[PDB]
C-alpha cells in the first residue's frame with residue numbers, strides 16, 4: 001500500500017526533477033522512501049561513507065558521526081571510513097546494528113589545498129578493499145552535520161550534488177576552470193551544472209574511476225605548474241561534464257542555512273555545513 | 278553546446294516525469310536527444326527489435342518496417358527479429374547502414390490468445406543468440422506504425438509503457454487480474470501503473486528474466502485451469518509491479534489517434550496502432 005503516482009498531477013512543479021540525460025534530480029516529494037528501502041534491502045546493500053579528518057578537523061568528527069547515526073542510511077548496512085593523521089583523536093561513537101567504522105591513518109600536507117586535493121588520491125589507494133566491503137561509496141566533507149534524512153534515494157552508479165550558491169545561476173557565472181592549460185578546463189558555453197566537491201558518490205567501481213581520473217588530472221597540472229581554481233572541485237566538475245552522473249542531488253543535500261536561509265523551494269535541509277574559523 | 282538545464286524552471290509542469298522509485302517517465306521535453314545519442318554512440322550500442330507476424334499479421338510488416346527505418350533508433354545499430362509462420366511473406370525492405378533483419382520461423386496456434394501469450398515463450402527460446410548479437414531488446418506489436426522519433430531515450434535495463442486508455446485513471450479501475458488463483462493476481466490496493474503488452478524492453482538479461490517469468494507464470498495458470506484476464510499483458514503488469522521498471526514510457530510511445538485524439542498533453546505521437554478488422 002502507498003499513494004498512487006498520478007501521471008497528470010506532478011508532485012513537484014516548481015523544480016526540475018530530471019536532467020536532460022534522464023537522470024533523476026533528487027528532491028523531497030519525488031520519491032517514496034518505502035519503495036526504495038524495499039529494493040535496497042533485497043540486495044542487502046552496504047554503503048561506505050568516507051570522510052577525512054586531518055589536523056584540527058578531527059574536531060568535526062563527533063557531531064558528524066552522531067548525526068550520521070540518526071540520519072544516514074538508517075536501517076541499512078553502513079561502513080564509515082575515517083581517514084586521519086590522529087587515530088587516537090577519533091571519538092568513540094556508538095553504532096546502530098549493521099554499522100561499523102574503520103580508521104585509516106594517513107600523512108598530512110601543510111597546505112590545505114593538497115589535503116582536500118589528495119582526498120582523490122587517498123580514496124583511490126584503498127582500492128581492492130572498498131570492492132569487497134561495500135557496494136556504494138559516498139564521499140563527504142567532515143565539517144558538516146546531518147539534520148534530516150539522507151538515504152538510499154541517493155544511491156546510483158554515479159552522483160553529484162548541486163552547489164547551493166549556484167543552482168539558480170547561469171553557466172557563464174559558474175566558477176569552473178577557464179584556463180585551457182589546466183586539465184580541468186571547461187569552455188564558456190559548456191556545462192550542465194556546477195557540482196560541489198563536498199558530496200559525491202556512486203558504485204565502488206564508478207567512484208574509483210572518478211577519483212583515479214581526478215588524481216591523474218591533478219598531477220598532470222602540477223607538472224605544468226598550474227593549480228585548478230577550486231582544486232578538486234574543479235576536476236570533479238570536469239569529470240562530471242564528460243561522465244554525466246546517473247543522479248543529481250538537489251541542494252537539500254548540501255546547504256548552509258546561515259549564508260542562504262531556508263527558501264520555500266527547499267522542503268528539507270538534510271546535510272549542512274558547520275561554522276569554522 | 279546545448280540549452281542549459283535550469284533547476285528552477287522545469288521543462289514539463291503538466292505531467293509526472295519521474296516515478297516514486299526515481300525512474301524517468303519519458304515525455305518530449307524531458308530529454309536532449311543529442312546528449313543521449315552521444316552516450317549511446319560511445320558504447321557502439323546495438324538494439325534488437327522483436328516483432329511477431331503470424332498468419333494474416335504478415336500484412337502489417339511492410340508499413341511497420343518502413344516506418345521503423347524512418348523513426349526507430351535512427352543512426353544506431355538495429356537488428357530486427359521477425360518471428361513468423363510465413364518467411365516468404367516477409368517483405369523485402371531496404372535497410373539503412375548498420376541495420377539488419379533476421380526471419381525466425383515458428384509454429385502457429387489456432388487461438389489468438391496463445392499467439393500473443395506464447396510470444397513470451399518464443400522471445401525467451403532465442404536465448405544465447407540475443408546475448409551476443411544485441412545489448413537491448415525491445416518487444417512490440419506488429420500492427421503498428423512509427424509516426425515520430427522512438428530512440429535511445431527509451432533504453433534502460435527495464436522499461437514498460439503506460440497503456441493509453443488508463444494513464445489518467447485510478448488503480449481500482451485498472452484491468453489487472455483480480456482472481457487470487459491466477460499467478461497474475463494483483464490486489465485492489467496495489468499497483469503503480471497499468472502497462473500495455475504491446476511495448477516493453479530493456480537489456481537482454483532483464484528481458485530474458487521477464488519473459489521467462491511470464492511464461493513460467495502462464496504455464497502454472499494453465500495447469501490450474503485458468504487463463505489471465507488480459508493474458509500476457511496481465512502477467513507483464515504483475516512482473517512490473519514486483520520488478521519495477523527503470524524507465525516508464527509515456528503514452529506518446531503507444532497511442533491510438535482514432536480512439537483518443539491528440540490531446541495537448543501529448544506533444545508527439547510516436548508509435549500508433551493500425552486499424553484492423
Ligand SMILES: O=c1ccn([C@@H]2O[C@H](COP(=O)(O)OP(=O)(O)O)[C@@H](O)[C@H]2O)c(=O)[nH]1
Pocket residue numbers: 051052053054055056057112115116140141142143198
Ligand atoms: O586541515 C584540513 C583541511 C581540510 N580537511 C578535509 O578536506 C575537507 C574540505 O575542506 P574544507 O571543508 O576546508 O573546504 P570548504 O568546505 O570550506 O571549502 C574537509 O572537510 C576535511 O574532510 C582536513 O581533513 N584537514
Ligand SMILES: O=c1ccn([C@@H]2O[C@H](COP(=O)(O)OP(=O)(O)O)[C@@H](O)[C@H]2O)c(=O)[nH]1
Pocket residue numbers: 328329330331332333334389392393417418419420475
Ligand atoms: O493471428 C495473430 C494474432 C496476433 N499476433 C501477434 O500478437 C500481437 C498482439 O495481438 P493483437 O495486436 O491482436 O492484440 P491487440 O493489440 O489488438 O490487443 C500482434 O501484434 C502480433 O505481433 C500475430 O502475429 N498473429
Ligand SMILES: OC[C@H]1O[C@@H](O)[C@H](O)[C@@H](O)[C@H]1O
Pocket residue numbers: 163165175196197230233
Ligand atoms: O565557486 C566555488 C566556491 O564557491 C564557494 O561558495 C564555496 O564556499 C567554495 O567551497 C567553492 O565551492
Ligand SMILES: OC[C@H]1O[C@@H](O)[C@H](O)[C@@H](O)[C@H]1O
Pocket residue numbers: 440442452473474507510
Ligand atoms: O484493459 C486492458 C485492455 O484494454 C483495451 O483498451 C486494449 O485494447 C486491450 O488490448 C487491453 O490492453
Ligand SMILES: [Mn+2]
Pocket residue numbers: 141142143198
Ligand atoms: Mn567543508
Ligand SMILES: [Mn+2]
Pocket residue numbers: 418419420475
Ligand atoms: Mn496490437
